[PDB]
Amino acid sequence: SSRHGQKGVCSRKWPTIDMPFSETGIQPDIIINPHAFPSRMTIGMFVESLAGKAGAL
Amino acid sequence: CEFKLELAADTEKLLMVNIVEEICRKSIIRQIPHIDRCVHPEPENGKRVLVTEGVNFQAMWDQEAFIDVDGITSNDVAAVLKTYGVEAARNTIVNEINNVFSRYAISVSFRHLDLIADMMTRQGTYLAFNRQGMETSTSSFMKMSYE
């Protein structure tokens, strides 16, 4: 679950090579489907994303 | 309007204006029995209608110089059974259960709402589905597990 109230179940352990690999070489840890958001109306997760990246850099 | 009353010279102080407030509000000036109030609704869907709370048919039957007596419909199941009989009630139930699902935009095929309605009127009167109507069934083990 996130801190924004998205409760979810691990579906499959996905091989490391099949994860879409970024321009920079970073496979994601966790993929989450966009269609969950517009019903649940959570923009704090979209914003916590940016605030997380700009913090880690 | 002004008038006077008198009572025994030896009496208590018993509260009056409360008594007046009590009798004024049961003071039935003119009451065509069970009728309450009138409201003129909107000329919906090309149909032109009046609606009044309370149910009295024998009163509404004398107005036909004004309102038509053939198209008078009710929201009550029983009072339509007292006058028009089991058939107009069986036809009413469907139109009551319909209008509940018509406002929710949902839809329920009338083949179901006919089976319920015909299953209530099988005795000629209006039976619930609760304990009181199931009383007349033949088999015990159906009733014996219910309540």
Partner: protein, 85 residues
């Protein structure tokens, strides 16, 4: 409906169709009246003066509620004259 069998529902109604020729002003004409009417509707105030006591009732202007509730000075006297007391 289903669960009850109830002979007295919470809020019953009837539905009244009307003729075409009857106007929209005649709509407000016919059924506004023929409603349940309490004498408490026309009473502005009551005075109780004390061994005996006196009753005063100051109504509204006759012309006012004659047009609205459609009651006239005649019946209004008769109903008070009998069942009230």
């Amino acid at each position: 409906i289903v669960m009850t069998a109830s002979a007295a529902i919470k809020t019953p109604q009837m539905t009244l169709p009307i003729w075409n020729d009857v106007s929209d002003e005649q709509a407000d004409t016919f059924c506004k009246s023929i409603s349940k009417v309490l004498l408490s509707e026309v009473i502005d105030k009551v005075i109780v003066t004390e061994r005996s006591y006196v009753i005063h009732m100051r109504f509204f202007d006759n012309n006012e509620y004659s047009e609205e509730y459609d009651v006239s000075k005649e019946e209004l006297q008769n109903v008070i004259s009998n069942q009230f007391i």
